[PDB]
Structure 1
């Protein structure tokens, strides 16, 4: 638990969500101060669902150590509950690409490849993310991506490869059977890839959840983004494999991205 006295928050929020606010801050550490991004729960965290989510979020991040995952500094209880993370200065991947249409496809391949390495680590750690979307990828630089937002994440039971409980990111077995696996994160990764090469457009634009579900059950898939490398669109369709057992894991996905970046 962090000392609210060692934390300075900037008044102007970086943004907001259903949960409350994200603020920039500075946290005094040993000798230097470190720039932090602070997730702050709305209305003094009166909502127990928000309090539960933040505590589970922190519990998961405390266990993870990987260069492509956002590091948690700690949690602070004062005026509201706050989650203190190492600042990734450029912010969410989708908003950044929306405002930077000049980013090259080779650049995008690099960033989604780093996501796949973060997710390979999570997969080998037997955690499922369950909210893998472009909005939950944070940019340290234009060439350094990190995964954040573990509010929905779960550590898997040692005897099963799925957890049994954002529909546009969810695989069929999540919608049909409430079963979340690393393979279901791979499906979401495909949508995240589609968002990245669409410079941050929303997937399945203008469709209701039930309409997305029927489209996928018919065997249809989102089309290829303008200017998207063909091999990357082929990889998205492999991520959108209907059958869980046939869909690739993150080991295979990471290797495919590594090989294709080498080719570019």
Structure 2
């Protein structure tokens, strides 16, 4: 995975510095546009290296693709493919809804649940599954990613919980209550991500304050079916949001339900 900082031209920051220390670059060797995550320097060197190691272990059509890293000498790089249409959240808000119709929404959900079915089998845990962490390429190709948005991001999307920031409105109750993350809380976050897709990137639990979200989920409040969302997709959302993690379907299951539907 190692490669020459001589094979890479660092150009502008991607998405106007929304992704933090991540740069648009060219992989000279192949006249290729890449994304390069850099490191400041900060005492974040530990988690940056776990990250590269993890990425080495995973490969799937629907996971953002590692291409190389630069971790002998600073500056420390990690290098992936570059996705033309950018993050999914903005893509949905900005799209031609006649192009990105019902069938496309469904295709988008399918691909993500295939990426997740994969991490599941490899016993990985994403931990921050959301449209903002997905990328779109040509022909509505969607890849799941993880950009480390907790400390970058600008607003009430992430809120503080003991030196950590959690996106409350994506977070499974057991994770809010007991700090318990598992593939099942990924399943919960996928149900919220389903709702983002169906509302074309609306914010979840609109206007509901953060501090009442847990209490509402406990009293069994769930977000309504969006306008135009197939009932079986919504029933699936409803299963991802089962109170008990073990009552939640698996991404194997979800992917199968989504693969059938794709008709």
The TM-score with structure 2 as length reference comes to 0.85
| Structure 2 SS opposite 1:75 | strand
Count of matched residue pairs = 242
Residue 180 of structure 1: how far off its partner (Å): 1.4
The equivalent position to 1:135 in structure 2, one of 119, 123, 132, is: 132
**Kept in 1: contact 2:12–2:25 (CA 8 A):** no
Q: Which residue of 2 aligns with 1:159?
A: none
| Structure 2 SS opposite 1:97 | helix
Q: Which residue of 1 aligns with 2:156?
A: none
CA distance in 2, matches of 1:247, 1:58: 30
* Structure 2: tracts of 5 or more residues without a match: 150-166
Residue 12 of structure 1: how far off its partner (Å): 5.5
Higher strand share: 1
The answer as to 2:65 corresponding to 1:71 is yes
The TM-score with structure 1 as length reference comes to 0.84
**Kept in 2: contact 1:24–1:38 (CA 8 A):** yes
| Structure 2 SS opposite 1:110 | helix
| Structure 2 SS opposite 1:257 | helix
Residue 56 of structure 1: how far off its partner (Å): 2.3
Structure 1 runs of 4+ aligned residues shifted over 4 Å read: 77-80
CA 1:222–1:142 in structure 2 vs 1: closer, same or farther (change >3 Å)? farther
The root-mean-square deviation of aligned C-alpha atoms, in Å, is 2.1
Q: What aligned pairs does 1:24-35 form with structure 2 within 5 A after superposition?
A: 24-29=24-29, 32-35=30-33
Residue 72 of structure 1: how far off its partner (Å): 1.1
* Structure 1: tracts of 5 or more residues without a match: 153-165
| Structure 1 SS opposite 2:62 | coil
The answer as to 2:34 corresponding to 1:39 is no
